[PDB]
């Protein structure tokens, strides 16, 4: 008897309202949902997790003084090309990226981890354009 | 119906008509043997604690063999340590006759 290997199954779309949730604590759960580790036929070598639409990313919440103190960091490869962007500003200029960056770092690195990041669709504001997939609204 | 049986330190899900290789059993080829049962499933469900008392699966031993050779090789750098061993694990081939639930 050899272990079961699934045939390619249809991925469920899922909807999450980010409003008021804690940044990192929401993140681990989206990652798990992205791996598909909530599925008993989980297989690490194929993309079989869920798709995740997230709305209200701009109204995510964070504890302590990280609003002014969490610095996101970017290096251009040129001398002196390390720019520093505090959390506040990232919310104010590309809010959806705070959640994206948090999730990205929690997925495995490599070709498969990069495609799972694609399966995540993050929006600021109450709405998304994904009606066509009629996403199932999950609590988390 | 299926049964979960335990032979040679390992467990296997078996059914009537199943061909199975397991660690070599001490039994003449063509003979018949009873495997202990940990769980029966399908129509009825009975859960062994760890084995179930009344149950057994009968198996006709088709015969015994040696597996495809594995080369087990060893090497340590800067020391001239090298070993080459050839390995074939013995097995017994069974056909599952019936689940005597």
């Amino acid at each position: 008897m050899k272990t079961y290997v699934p045939k390619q199954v249809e991925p469920r779309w899922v909807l999450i309202d980010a409003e008021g949730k804690t940044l990192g604590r929401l993140a681990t759960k989206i990652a798990t949902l992205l791996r598909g580790k909530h599925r008993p036929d989980w297989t690490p070598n194929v993309a079989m997790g869920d798709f995740v639409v997230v709305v209200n990313a701009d109204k995510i919440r964070v504890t302590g003084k990280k609003l002014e103190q969490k610095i996101y960091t970017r290096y251009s490869g040129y001398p002196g090309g390390l720019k520093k962007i505090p959390l506040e500003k990232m919310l104010a200029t590309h809010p959806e990226r705070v959640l994206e960056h948090a999730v990205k770092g929690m997925l495995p690195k490599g070709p498969l981890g990069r495609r799972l990041f694609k399966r995540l669709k993050v929006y600021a504001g109450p709405d998304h354009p994904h009606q066509a997939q009629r996403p199932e609204k999950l609590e988390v | 119906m299926f049964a979960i049986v335990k032979t040679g330190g390992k467990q296997y899900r078996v059914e009537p008509g199943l061909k199975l290789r397991v660690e070599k059993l001490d039994a003449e080829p063509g003979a018949t043997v009873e495997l202990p049962v940990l769980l029966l499933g399908g129509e009825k469900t009975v859960v062994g604690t760890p084995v179930v008392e009344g149950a057994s699966v009968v198996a006709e031993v088709l015969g015994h063999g040696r597996g495809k050779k594995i080369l087990v090789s060893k090497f340590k750098a800067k020391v001239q340590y090298r070993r080459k061993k050839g390995h074939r694990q013995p097995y017994t081939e069974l056909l599952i006759k019936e689940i005597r639930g």
Binding site: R39, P40, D41 | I4, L38, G41, V47, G48, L71
Partner: protein
Amino acid sequence: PRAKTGVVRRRKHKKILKLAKGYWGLRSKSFRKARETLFAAGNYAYAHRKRRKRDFRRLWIVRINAACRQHGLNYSTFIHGLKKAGIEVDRKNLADLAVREPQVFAELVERAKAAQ
């Protein structure tokens, strides 16, 4: 009498090169590079048989977990319960159940919640 190398060495290199079939660049073409590659492949093999036993168990564990949290408990609580109950079905088999026979697995879940 003189014993030149003659036929013996070629036959030893060939033995190796065949074993090296499939390797990249000189590693299947040069006798010397093959031998280097085969030492690695041999220690990699041995190690990976050992490691494979682990690898699968870790997959079995992840799988049991998902089907446990469908009934409101975690793998850690599950394994405790079966343990108290005296159910000795291995993780390999639990996993087949959790996917192939979800009713039977739910039952096992039942017993584990009972046992504590």
